[PDB]
């Protein structure tokens, strides 16, 4: 019978609720009611990058703190040089509708993807020094929203068919497919060991996978609306989430509970991109009201604003060494803050 | 004094900038149209009947999972781009944000099917009041006019049952019936058109409009209607930056 199954599910939900209530003791704010406030940080755009003819939807920082690839609905994958505002590559996309981007942690590959349910992988360094689609990965029955290069031979893709998959570039197969979401999976962030990754779905819930084994370990609730972005703490034990209910949230793995919610009454629009800082004390986050918001993980008090955009901020990423923040927005302009 | 690396990088950047400048004209000389509808709307037939105006050039292989489609047609050397959405899930709340820089959203409605016409009305209302589609004009294509004409002139329809306003309704004064059309068919057509225009006029303000059209099934002038509506939209947009309208 289905009614007994629903009753068992309700009882298990109550059991999980009371189990999580057994470790709350003191909230994060109570423990952290001693830290000095971070203070107002004013960031001014050091470099602004021009050349995209349409809204830019994604961007990734290369693992050298220098190069940066941007994806725009024009149909271009421009590879920049934030040091000198120099364009290095201008890869033309087969499908103009692209909503994700990636940079391999070697500088050799750059992936993309979009409404075409496909993941185009571009080889950056060939014998002729030209870009070309090394492989095209198909098998997703929905629009694709995030690609993160797990390695030089594996990428994890999150699509709109409520599933996440791990691919093998050499063959193009779907070695491991992650299922369990009831809505579109928007953004995913790997952990700083390339062993675990988490994905935020549109069903107002986040989950953590096991890459190798391929099943959920825990699920996290608390968000009221669709999750548009998600990041990872540099220690691999926390991950911030940004949703359409205008509230950023900080989850934890060992505690398996919500730790802090960042919100303000002046803020009513959702979050489009989230990126932690190097020390995990600056939770930068984009917003639909054309400006980002420099939060902080512990004090949870909005410190600074990188307001320089005339349209929705669509991507935001802190560099590996921590000396730059790039903000690409629907006004077709990338800005490097510092 | 640096030369070498810096000189080569500047040369490459200049070449890439030349390519981007050349691609700007091509990108801005074409109009992108989003085609929206349902399964029982003749949308595939509409795509087929505008596609006739455009090493193997045949690309019937494509991908089994498809994704997004494309159909480029040329009218008076304007090169429209029409994006029919393929194999995607039911919910469209988070990929419809991609279609915010679009000349017009073509919407196709089955006027004949009274049972599901309320679903089309609700979908059109949702499209009208979307935050990222508050400046995108919608071209309305009330498909299957021949089936409607067959249906009203045969009884067993009872449009009043589905819509309790047909009885207390009158033919619009500005009606232009086609020669040979019965008054009942024109009454039903304009009733459906006014049902959609009630949502179109409410809210909306003045930054985006709706262009109703009585496309039957296979009319060759669907593409000309699309061209004329796009031209009017562009003219109205250009008259607004100058604050002349």
């Amino acid at each position: 019978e289905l009614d007994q199954l629903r009753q068992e599910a309700e009882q298990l939900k109550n059991q999980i609720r009371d189990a999580r209530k057994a470790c709350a003791d003191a909230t994060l704010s109570q423990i952290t009611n001693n830290i000095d406030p971070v203070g107002r940080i004013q960031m001014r755009t050091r470099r602004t990058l021009r050349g995209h003819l349409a809204k830019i939807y994604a961007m990734h920082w290369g693992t050298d703190s220098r190069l940066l690839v941007s994806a725009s609905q024009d149909g271009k994958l421009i590879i920049w040089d934030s040091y000198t505002t120099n364009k290095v590559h201008a890869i033309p996309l087969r499908s103009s509708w692209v909503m994700t981007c990636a940079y391999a942690p070697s500088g050799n590959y750059v992936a993309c993807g979009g409404l075409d349910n496909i993941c185009s992988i571009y080889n950056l360094k060939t014998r002729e020094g030209n870009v070309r689609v090394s492989r095209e990965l198909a098998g997703h029955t929905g629009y694709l929203s995030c690609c993160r290069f797990l390695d030089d031979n594996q990428i994890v893709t999150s699509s709109g068919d409520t599933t996440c998959a791990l691919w093998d570039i050499e063959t193009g197969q779907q070695t491991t497919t992650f299922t369990g979401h009831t809505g579109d999976v928007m953004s995913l962030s790997l952990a700083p060991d390339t062993r675990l990754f988490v994905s935020g779905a549109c069903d107002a819930s986040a989950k953590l996978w096991d890459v190798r084994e391929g099943m959920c370990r825990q699920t996290f609730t608390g968000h009221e609306s669709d999750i548009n972005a998600i990041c990872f703490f540099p220690n691999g034990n926390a991950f911030a989430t940004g949703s359409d209910d205008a509230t950023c949230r900080l989850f934890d793995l060992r505690a398996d509970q919500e730790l802090m919610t960042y919100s303000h009454d002046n803020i009513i629009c959702g979050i489009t991109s989230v990126s932690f800082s190097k020390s995990g004390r600056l939770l930068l986050a984009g917003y639909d009201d054309f400006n980002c918001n420099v939060w902080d993980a512990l004090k949870a008090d909005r410190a600074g604003v990188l307001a320089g955009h005339d349209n929705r901020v669509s991507c935001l990423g802190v560099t590996d060494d921590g000396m730059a923040v790039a903000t690409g927005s629907w006004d077709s302009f990338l800005k490097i803050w510092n | 004094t640096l030369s070498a690396e810096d000189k080569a990088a500047v040369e490459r950047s200049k070449m890439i900038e030349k390519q981007l400048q050349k691609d700007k004209q091509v990108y801005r000389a074409t109009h992108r149209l989003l085609l929206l509808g349902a399964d029982n709307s003749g949308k595939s037939t509409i795509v087929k009947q505008m596609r006739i105006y455009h090493q193997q050039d045949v690309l019937r292989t494509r991908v089994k999972t498809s994704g997004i489609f494309e159909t480029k047609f040329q009218v008076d050397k304007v090169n429209f781009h029409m994006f029919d959405v393929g194999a995607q899930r039911d919910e469209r709340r988070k990929w419809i944000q991609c279609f915010n820089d679009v000349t017009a959203i073509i919407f196709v409605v089955d006027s004949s099917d009274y049972n599901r016409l309320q679903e089309a009305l609700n979908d059109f209302k949702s499209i009208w009041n979307n935050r990222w589609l508050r400046t995108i004009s919608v071209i309305l294509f009330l498909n299957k006019q021949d089936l409607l004409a067959e249906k009203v002139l045969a009884g067993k329809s009872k449009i009043e049952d589905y819509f309790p306003e047909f009885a207390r309704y009158t033919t619009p004064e500005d009606a232009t019936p086609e020669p040979g059309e019965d008054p009942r068919v024109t009454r039903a057509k304009y009733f459906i058109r006014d049902e959609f225009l009630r949502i179109s006029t409410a809210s909306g303000d003045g930054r985006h409009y709706c262009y109703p059209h009585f496309t039957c099934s296979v009319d060759t002038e669907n593409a000309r209607r699309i061209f004329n509506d796009c031209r009017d939209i562009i003219q109205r947009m250009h008259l607004r930056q100058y604050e002349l309208l």
Partner: nanobody, 126 residues
Framework: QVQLQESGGGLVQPGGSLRLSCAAS????????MNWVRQAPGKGLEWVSD????????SYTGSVKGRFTISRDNAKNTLYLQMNSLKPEDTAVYYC?????????????????????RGQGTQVTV
């Protein structure tokens, strides 16, 4: 965790009156536009009525106009639908749905097959 529970469905003779209540939890009730969706057997989901954040704006489908009444209690986090003069064609599973995002007028995907913020349904038979 967004949860919606419906009650008040049961067997009723034609022309009777049935009241449905939908208690919501896990989200700020006053900030969302709530809907009612019914699924007749052998058919798909059909939108019935919707109510705005403040309860001012109200709309109904054609088949139920003048017979159904929808109201919301922001303080009690409950959504109501008063049904009058039930017809045999009104026999369906009734779901209490919610708009995906707050402070917005567009209610997308409320009638979808696998919508997330929707109740599990109550059976009404006439």
């Amino acid at each position: 965790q967004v949860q919606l529970q419906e009650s008040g469905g049961g067997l009723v003779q034609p022309g009777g009156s049935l009241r449905l209540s939908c208690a919501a939890s896990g989200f700020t009730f006053s900030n969302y536009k709530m809907n009612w969706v019914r699924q007749a057997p052998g058919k798909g989901l059909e939108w019935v009525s919707d109510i705005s954040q403040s309860g001012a704006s109200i709309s109904y489908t054609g088949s139920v106009k003048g017979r159904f009444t929808i109201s919301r209690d922001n303080a009690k986090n409950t959504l109501y639908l008063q049904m009058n003069s039930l017809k045999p064609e009104d026999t369906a599973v009734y779901y209490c749905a919610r708009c995906p995002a707050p402070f917005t007028r567009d209610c997308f995907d409320v009638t979808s097959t696998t919508y997330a913020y929707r109740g599990q349904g109550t059976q009404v038979t006439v």
